[PDB]
Scaffold this active site. Structure first.
Site, PDB file in Angstrom:
ATOM      1  N   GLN C  11       0.825  -1.201   0.000  1.00  0.00           N
ATOM      2  CA  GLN C  11       0.000   0.000   0.000  1.00  0.00           C
ATOM      3  C   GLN C  11       0.857   1.248   0.000  1.00  0.00           C
ATOM      4  OE1 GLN C  11      -2.976   0.489   2.972  1.00  0.00           O
ATOM      5  NE2 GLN C  11      -4.578  -0.289   1.625  1.00  0.00           N
ATOM      6  N   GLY C 133       3.460  -6.262   5.987  1.00  0.00           N
ATOM      7  CA  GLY C 133       3.988  -7.554   5.607  1.00  0.00           C
ATOM      8  C   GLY C 133       4.608  -7.614   4.230  1.00  0.00           C
ATOM      9  N   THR C 168       1.040   2.763  14.042  1.00  0.00           N
ATOM     10  CA  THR C 168      -0.223   2.280  13.521  1.00  0.00           C
ATOM     11  C   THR C 168      -0.385   0.777  13.659  1.00  0.00           C
ATOM     12  OG1 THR C 168      -1.661   2.325  11.591  1.00  0.00           O
ATOM     13  CG2 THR C 168       0.691   2.004  11.226  1.00  0.00           C
ATOM     14  N   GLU C 243      26.500   8.756  -9.171  1.00  0.00           N
ATOM     15  CA  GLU C 243      27.355   9.909  -8.902  1.00  0.00           C
ATOM     16  C   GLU C 243      27.343  10.304  -7.430  1.00  0.00           C
ATOM     17  OE1 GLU C 243      28.933  11.223 -11.557  1.00  0.00           O
ATOM     18  OE2 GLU C 243      29.791  13.079 -10.758  1.00  0.00           O
TER      19      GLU C 243
HETATM   20  N1  LIG Z   1      -2.179   7.571   6.587  1.00  0.00           N
HETATM   21  C1  LIG Z   1      -1.395   7.159   5.610  1.00  0.00           C
HETATM   22  N2  LIG Z   1      -0.515   6.132   5.817  1.00  0.00           N
HETATM   23  C2  LIG Z   1       0.304   5.691   4.831  1.00  0.00           C
HETATM   24  C3  LIG Z   1       0.238   6.302   3.590  1.00  0.00           C
HETATM   25  N3  LIG Z   1       1.121   5.728   2.767  1.00  0.00           N
HETATM   26  C4  LIG Z   1       1.746   4.767   3.460  1.00  0.00           C
HETATM   27  N4  LIG Z   1       1.252   4.695   4.733  1.00  0.00           N
HETATM   28  C5  LIG Z   1       1.800   3.741   5.732  1.00  0.00           C
HETATM   29  O1  LIG Z   1       1.835   2.401   5.311  1.00  0.00           O
HETATM   30  C6  LIG Z   1       2.330   1.687   6.423  1.00  0.00           C
HETATM   31  C7  LIG Z   1       1.821   0.266   6.430  1.00  0.00           C
HETATM   32  O2  LIG Z   1       1.416  -0.054   5.131  1.00  0.00           O
HETATM   33  P1  LIG Z   1       0.308  -1.191   4.950  1.00  0.00           P
HETATM   34  O3  LIG Z   1      -1.051  -0.582   4.767  1.00  0.00           O
HETATM   35  O4  LIG Z   1       0.332  -2.138   6.118  1.00  0.00           O
HETATM   36  O5  LIG Z   1       0.747  -1.923   3.607  1.00  0.00           O
HETATM   37  P2  LIG Z   1       2.021  -2.870   3.684  1.00  0.00           P
HETATM   38  O6  LIG Z   1       3.107  -2.199   4.467  1.00  0.00           O
HETATM   39  O7  LIG Z   1       2.528  -3.179   2.315  1.00  0.00           O
HETATM   40  O8  LIG Z   1       1.465  -4.180   4.415  1.00  0.00           O
HETATM   41  P3  LIG Z   1       0.086  -4.816   3.906  1.00  0.00           P
HETATM   42  O9  LIG Z   1      -1.070  -4.183   4.625  1.00  0.00           O
HETATM   43  O10 LIG Z   1       0.080  -6.295   4.155  1.00  0.00           O
HETATM   44  O11 LIG Z   1      -0.065  -4.589   2.434  1.00  0.00           O
HETATM   45  C8  LIG Z   1       1.853   2.421   7.650  1.00  0.00           C
HETATM   46  O12 LIG Z   1       2.977   2.845   8.373  1.00  0.00           O
HETATM   47  C9  LIG Z   1       1.139   3.619   7.088  1.00  0.00           C
HETATM   48  O13 LIG Z   1       1.416   4.754   7.860  1.00  0.00           O
HETATM   49  C10 LIG Z   1      -0.648   7.336   3.376  1.00  0.00           C
HETATM   50  O14 LIG Z   1      -0.701   7.872   2.277  1.00  0.00           O
HETATM   51  N5  LIG Z   1      -1.460   7.767   4.391  1.00  0.00           N
END
Ligand SMILES: Nc1nc2c(ncn2[C@@H]2O[C@H](COP(=O)(O)OP(=O)(O)OP(=O)(O)O)[C@@H](O)[C@H]2O)c(=O)[nH]1
Ligand SMILES: Nc1nc2c(ncn2[C@@H]2O[C@H](COP(=O)(O)OP(=O)(O)OP(=O)(O)O)[C@@H](O)[C@H]2O)c(=O)[nH]1
Ligand SMILES: Nc1nc2c(ncn2[C@@H]2O[C@H](COP(=O)(O)OP(=O)(O)O)[C@@H](O)[C@H]2O)c(=O)[nH]1
Ligand SMILES: Nc1nc2c(ncn2[C@@H]2O[C@H](COP(=O)(O)OP(=O)(O)O)[C@@H](O)[C@H]2O)c(=O)[nH]1
Ligand SMILES: [Mg+2]
Ligand SMILES: [Mg+2]
Lengths: 427, 426, 429, 428
Positions: C11, C133, C168, C243
């Site tokens: 994400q 994860g 979080t 670089e």
């Molecule tokens: N509030 C917010 N949090 C974000 C954003 N982009 C990334 N994160 C962060 O993404 C981190 C965790 O990502 P996840 O949603 O768990 O996705 P992942 O790390 O790939 O793990 P999965 O849920 O299994 O996919 C957290 O620390 C969030 O804070 C955003 O645009 N807004």
């Protein structure tokens, strides 16, 4: 082109600031968005942003300024208010702020000083009333001393008028207000407000005066004090030739000043003015800025600034005749020891000021020993009070102990020793 | 802009929860449905002292109120301004003390003190701006004076930060509103000793000595009294809601007014007190009204002046006004009448300035007479608890609700500390 | 020509990949359907259509699906958006052992499709987060397969760091130490940008109350243009990926610089301010205006790498860095005499509509390696030690392949790295 | 795409399913006759989670509904909805369980099980990949408790990796319905601590107290209480159904909760539950009023945090929200209250945000909490199981039904093992 930063604290400071920045922004062409010399720098767009150490604690201090006419003149990050309040005394104003408002702005003083060209001095307005005008100066002044070096910091003041004095309770503030001006000393004027109210009664023909008229006059004070770095240079002097040249020791730095601008448009536009008649009116006893009779003391060394249509012939003629004058009780060690400095703009007033369009002004600035009567009056009131342990609790809760008022008392007794030792002869 | 939660308790407490909340709901323009009606935009920004946002811009006050039985909270609800209070924070009592002190203190209000601390921690959670709870009670009551004291108890023992402005009605002893009112007075004047910060004495005759003697009203009302019981006298709290020359705030105010941390007694006058037949012949200015305060007719508290020392004085003024005749005529009467004025006080006032005048008033000079010299009426109360102490008027009622005889003899040797604290200045 | 490939995971990769490929299309003339009316990142077809080189790999299908139905349907080639079936569920163990290895071979077959087209490749940019994860499990498995299959190329990677105070998730300290240790030997230069410190800049500097998920991404998305404005445009001193790869990291167990973008001001605060080339070098080393909660007043600056954009002049650049090094209000290094790296480029940043960063003629990206990153790990040394003292949450991880010693053999490697920040911080005689 | 198969069990099981399949059928916009009706295409794109496409564009749910008396099962066929269920998926006995756990576990109900598990494979082989099943039941009587344990332990063998949820209804002393209530729910926790991945505790005493003191209704009948309270917490899985910024489905939220594999007992709650009248006066920001729930007037189970320590806490939100005010309001709530949290975990809260609120609400939120104060419920139902079993009060409807007297002394020590594990982490 010589540069400075100004300070307007408390009600007296901020209505003097309404006045003082109004006259800065009228004697330069400063219009409320920025585009139409000596206090700012420009941008990529290119526009007057006044450099600015200000400090204010309250809920609604300068939100009336923010709602006021000159609202986009002042850029807002440089003007300082918090989320919490310092309750007003010397004690609470000293000791619940020293983690809160002065210590994140010790990082803010970065922008407002570096790009000035001739980094020459600061102009601080304070009042002896309460725990904002007097008590918030102390934290500030030790910051300026511990980080700046040998720049000038000129204190403009209200003196608590020798019978009436109203704010949060004045003397326990005032004793460490001057035990604060012990620490950092350049030059510190006071004004008695009652003499202003009575010269407003008599010279100006103002029956029932109001709150406005004092602070425009303190604006003309700071104008003819430190616009010599701002206007043309004929014999160009600075506050570097004001603070070095008035007062020798850090014990007594308390002058007084009655201007040619103390006289109104309705009344003394009638009177003919010349340098001799103005300086006579300066050295007359009635019109003084603190209510001390100047004859009951020794004139130490008068250090003059000049406005108006002056001439180096007649100003030196009046200087010589005043130095001869002996009802002016002069000091023993030297009749000499003056300073003069020149500008050339005749008085045509700001809106909201009641003075005239005459071609001339002269700025009297004089040190006298004749105010130790009022200082002994204030010290009389403090040692009349403190021996019954009145108003202990909310000065001693936050840091101002019982032994600390007594050490402040004995420090100021040694300062009255300095008063008599400067005043009296020696072999 | 700094928050107050107007605490109030008793049959007076929910009725003084009508007329304080008339003048504040007139000052900021509160409609009966909540949504805004005022014109100028300085009234909307400072308004979050009291109220709280909702959906649709509705404002609703955060105020903790305590009442005695469910029959007196409702007679102010069906009034002009009762539709505006959300009714969770009217707490209620099945049984009251009926002119006593401790029925709802130990055992009946033990559930009510465990539910308003589910309420003060539910609407004094967000105290980011709060300087004080203006806390008032009624001390003939049992739920307004038992729980109101257990509002003082389980708050002010934790957090000492608050200003405590009492319009808490001490019933005066000339014609008292009950014979038995001294007993719960001597625990209450004692409960005014330990904690109070800026504090009047309301003796109801001194409000009853206003409408006839000054305002020329033939047939007054408590609801006509209640404009003066609190509503004018919350022109102490005005500088946090409207700016001025020398701006104030109550926590800021709280540090000039406390020399010695106990003594807490005033004698004010909201200096507009003129009739409508004497409204034709008065100039509304900041000189004239304060110069009318100085008489022997204008007090909301206790004492006839020349009957003691002036250990502190306070002040709050109104409007865009004149800076000189505030300080010309205050000292013109300070140092002319040098017989009354005590020798060892120079500069005790705090002249605060409020820009917005109270509504409908041209210029309203307001003043408060601080003192500690109210003891020409506070030794007369303390010599009339001991009548019921020795002969034991109701202790057979008193001891049964988890009470011993050591609780009310503490308030014999510790109410007298305040008598022992004018011991230094007699 | 020289060209590189962006990779996003999870994400936290897709939601900033969709915000950094936002900026690239508005920098150039590409309208979102592709047909323009830069050939490092994009790729020509025979009909004038342009397709970027980017893979958005993730496991949970509901975050990649806004790319397939949003505004940018026809831009990305649909064999480059790779989705799974069930998510990793906040386990390092699930995303590294059980659910990850089905997708190890599909993505490593799609990467060769982009790199066969590449004439001479430079870098693979990774955008992973240490929290979840598939952003820490599959990322670690990806970077030990990229080094095997693609030899010695530069690989740059980012972070969304687990903050000190706010967090979080509860299982964050288990994932973050388990993801650094296995990528401590493969990655080249990681960027630590903490998620908490971007919140506070949005209070003080750029005063937007309630900053949502987008307004963190646009601020991170402006860094990725500033680091790679030298592979797209012409400059006086363009700095490529290799670089500044060697001018930043002194020892191969030390690759964690920080990032700082100097002008972040609101458009009500772009009336009154100079944005001068000496004024926006003061603001990079201020402790308030950084982007990880670790203040370098406790640290010695191992190196700095500065990158400038806009209307700059190479006279006043060297005037400022002299005026930096002299003062002791701002602190410096004890044994590195040169210490710096300067880059210049011409095109000023272009503001995407709806943004809040006002249009500024002169922008600075800053990169530095400090000895003050140890306090963000001696913090994390103990917070994992609270967890593993009583064997909390170990039953979830052990069920999918890990022995319980791999909690300790990754602890002891991490517990010996603190000396590697203490032996170099000590002075030499 | 990530399927869920709904199971119901008992008369309480079929007045939850008839109110749960109403709320979700309003989210996806489905008529009672079973066609599609909504406006946005975001609804229909994840309809293959709880539903199943039939011919003609119809949509039917995948729910296996059981009871042992046909009197309950007819009443679902004539309701507000209920014509959308397939009539093959209704299974029911002929003679009731006698409000007896032993009858509903061994002799009266085990004939039904081989028809009930046989529908379950048919709703499993049409899937892509199941997150796992979901059983709604009550711990009062034999069709919901004894069948509910026999259903779970027959599924958890054959489909072990796919997770299991359950929605228990534990009994309460001051609102008690049956004399056999402490004699069932002590004997069925033993078969529930072994084969369930995530369990809840939703008891009828707490749902009465929030219905007279929060919502301020007059007559809370069982339709007007089950819908607005406990058929809407089961819509916590909007993460698994709707896209969001930071999302967390039903499986990602189990791993942040259970720090030892035998402590899975939760206490849910819903955040906007104001009234008919106080909905007019409150503020729909992200406050701390129902969001500091520690004053526990709005908690959906009996016991509360004041007496013990929270192990781990959830919060699943729903709305167009800002992710700063999610996080600083996890900072007014961990420090202004300080000692009700576990010492050895410094970040106890797992959060999530999605983007479609419920109908008629700008803003909503769901709270799922784990605590060490839940052991006071499990002592207290074992006080009324030790007392009745001492004199052998109602024994002989259990010894004659294949269950011996040895299976009670197992389910008393193992019932008091859970009191032992939770009391270890009481303060430590
Ligand atoms: N509030 C917010 N949090 C974000 C954003 N982009 C990334 N994160 C962060 O993404 C981190 C965790 O990502 P996840 O949603 O768990 O996705 P992942 O790390 O790939 O793990 P999965 O849920 O299994 O996919 C957290 O620390 C969030 O804070 C955003 O645009 N807004
Ligand atoms: N010169 C001048 N003085 C004023 C004016 N208005 C009030 N003052 C004086 O200011 C003195 C006190 O200083 P203030 O600035 O008002 O008080 P402060 O302590 O700084 O601020 P607070 O803590 O809120 O009282 C009082 O003695 C007033 O007489 C004015 O218009 N002109
Ligand atoms: N001064 C004043 N007193 C009030 C007001 N409302 C009620 N009271 C007084 O409250 C006292 C009785 O109220 P309370 O003790 O609460 O009710 P009780 O228990 O029935 O005696 C009487 O002395 C009344 O005069 C008011 O608005 N002003
Ligand atoms: N939530 C809910 N609970 C109920 C309802 N009706 C009864 N209950 C309670 O839940 C339990 C239901 O008993 P149940 O097992 O269905 O009876 P049985 O099917 O004949 O064994 C009883 O303890 C009731 O107190 C309902 O409609 N909703
Ligand atoms: Mg002020
Ligand atoms: Mg995921």
């Amino acid at each position: 082109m010589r540069e400075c930063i100004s300070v307007h604290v408390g009600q007296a400071g901020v209505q003097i600031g309404n006045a003082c920045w109004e006259l800065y922004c009228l004697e330069h062409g400063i219009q409320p968005d920025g585009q139409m010399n000596t206090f700012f720098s420009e941008t990529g767009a290119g526009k007057h942003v006044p450099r600015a150490v200000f400090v204010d604690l309250e809920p609604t201090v300068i939100d009336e300024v923010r709602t006021g006419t000159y609202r986009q003149l002042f850029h807002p990050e440089q003007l300082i208010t918090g989320k919490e309040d310092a309750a007003n005394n010397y004690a609470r104003g000293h000791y619940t702020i020293g983690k809160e408002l002065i210590d994140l702005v010790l990082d803010r003083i970065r922008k407002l000083a570096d790009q000035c060209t001739g980094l020459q001095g600061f102009l601080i307005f304070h009042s002896f009333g309460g725990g904002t005008g007097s008590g918030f100066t102390s934290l500030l002044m030790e910051r300026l001393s511990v980080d700046y070096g040998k720049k000038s910091k000129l204190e403009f003041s209200i003196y608590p008028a020798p019978q009436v004095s109203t704010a949060v309770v004045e003397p326990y503030n005032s004793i460490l207000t001057t035990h604060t001006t012990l620490e950092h000393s350049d030059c510190a004027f006071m004004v008695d407000n009652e003499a202003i109210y009575d010269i407003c009664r008599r010279n100006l023909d103002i029956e029932r005066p109001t709150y406005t008229n004092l602070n425009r006059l303190i604006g003309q004070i700071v104008s003819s004090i430190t616009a010599s770095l701002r206007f043309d240079g004929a014999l160009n002097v600075d506050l570097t030739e004001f603070q070095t040249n008035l007062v020798p020791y850090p014990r007594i730095h308390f002058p007084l000043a009655t201007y040619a601008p103390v006289i109104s448009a309705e009344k003394a536009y009638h009177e003919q003015l010349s340098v001799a008649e103005i300086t006579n009116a300066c050295f007359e006893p009635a019109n003084q800025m603190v209510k001390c009779d100047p004859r009951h003391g020794k004139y130490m060394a008068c250090c003059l600034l000049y406005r108006g249509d002056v001439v180096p012939k007649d100003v030196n003629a009046a200087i010589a005749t005043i130095k001869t004058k002996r009802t002016i009780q002069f000091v023993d060690w030297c009749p000499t020891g003056f300073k003069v400095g020149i500008n050339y703009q005749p008085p045509t007033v700001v809106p909201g000021g009641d003075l005239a369009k005459v071609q001339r002004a002269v700025c009297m600035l004089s040190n006298t020993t004749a105010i130790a009567e009022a200082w002994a009056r204030l010290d009389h009131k403090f040692d009349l009070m403190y021996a019954k342990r009145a108003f202990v609790h909310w000065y001693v809760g936050e840091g101002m102990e019982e032994g600390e008022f007594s050490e402040a008392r004995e420090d100021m007794a040694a300062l009255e020793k300095d008063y008599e030792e400067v005043g009296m002869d020696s072999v | 802009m700094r928050e107050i939660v107007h605490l109030q308790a008793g049959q007076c407490g929910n009725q003084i929860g009508a007329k304080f909340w008339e003048v504040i709901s007139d000052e900021h323009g509160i409609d009966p449905t909540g949504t805004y009606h005022g014109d100028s935009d300085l009234q909307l920004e400072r308004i979050n002292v009291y109220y709280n946002e909702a959906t649709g811009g509705k404002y609703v006050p955060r105020a903790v109120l305590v009442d005695l039985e469910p029959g007196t909270m409702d007679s102010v609800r069906s009034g002009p301004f009762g539709q505006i209070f959300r009714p969770d924070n009217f707490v209620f009592g099945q049984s009251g003390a009926g002119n006593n002190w401790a029925k709802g203190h130990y055992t009946e209000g033990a559930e009510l003190v465990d539910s308003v601390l589910d309420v003060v921690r539910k609407e004094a959670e967000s105290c980011d701006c709060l300087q004080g709870f203006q806390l008032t009670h009624s001390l003939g009551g049992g739920t307004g004076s038992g729980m109101g004291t257990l509002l003082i108890s389980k708050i002010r023992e934790e957090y000492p930060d608050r200003i405590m402005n009492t319009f808490s009605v001490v019933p005066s002893p000339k014609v008292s509103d009950t014979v038995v009112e001294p007993y719960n007075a001597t625990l209450s004047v004692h409960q005014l000793v330990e904690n109070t910060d800026e504090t009047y004495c309301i003796d109801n005759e001194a409000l009853y000595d206003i409408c006839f003697r000054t305002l020329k009203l033939t047939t007054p009302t408590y609801g006509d009294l209640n404009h003066l019981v609190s509503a004018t006298m919350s022109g102490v709290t005005t500088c946090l809601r409207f700016p001025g020359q020398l701006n104030a705030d109550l926590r800021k105010l709280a540090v000039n007014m406390v020399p010695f941390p106990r003594l807490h007694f005033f004698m004010p006058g909201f200096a507009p007190l003129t009739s409508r037949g004497s409204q034709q012949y008065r100039a509304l200015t900041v000189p004239e009204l304060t110069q009318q305060m100085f008489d022997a007719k204008n007090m909301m508290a206790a004492c006839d002046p020349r009957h003691g020392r002036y250990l502190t004085v306070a002040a709050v003024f109104r409007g865009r006004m004149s800076m000189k005749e505030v300080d010309e005529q205050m000292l013109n009467v300070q140092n002319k009448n040098s017989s009354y004025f005590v020798e060892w006080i120079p500069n005790n006032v705090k002249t605060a300035v409020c820009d917005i005048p109270p509504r409908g008033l041209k210029m309203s000079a307001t003043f408060i007479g601080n003192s500690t010299a109210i003891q020409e009426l506070f030794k007369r109360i303390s010599e009339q608890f001991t009548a019921m102490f020795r002969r034991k008027a109701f202790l057979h009622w008193y001891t049964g609700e988890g009470m011993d005889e050591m609780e009310f003899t503490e308030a014999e040797s510790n109410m007298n500390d305040l008598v022992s604290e004018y011991q230094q200045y007699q």
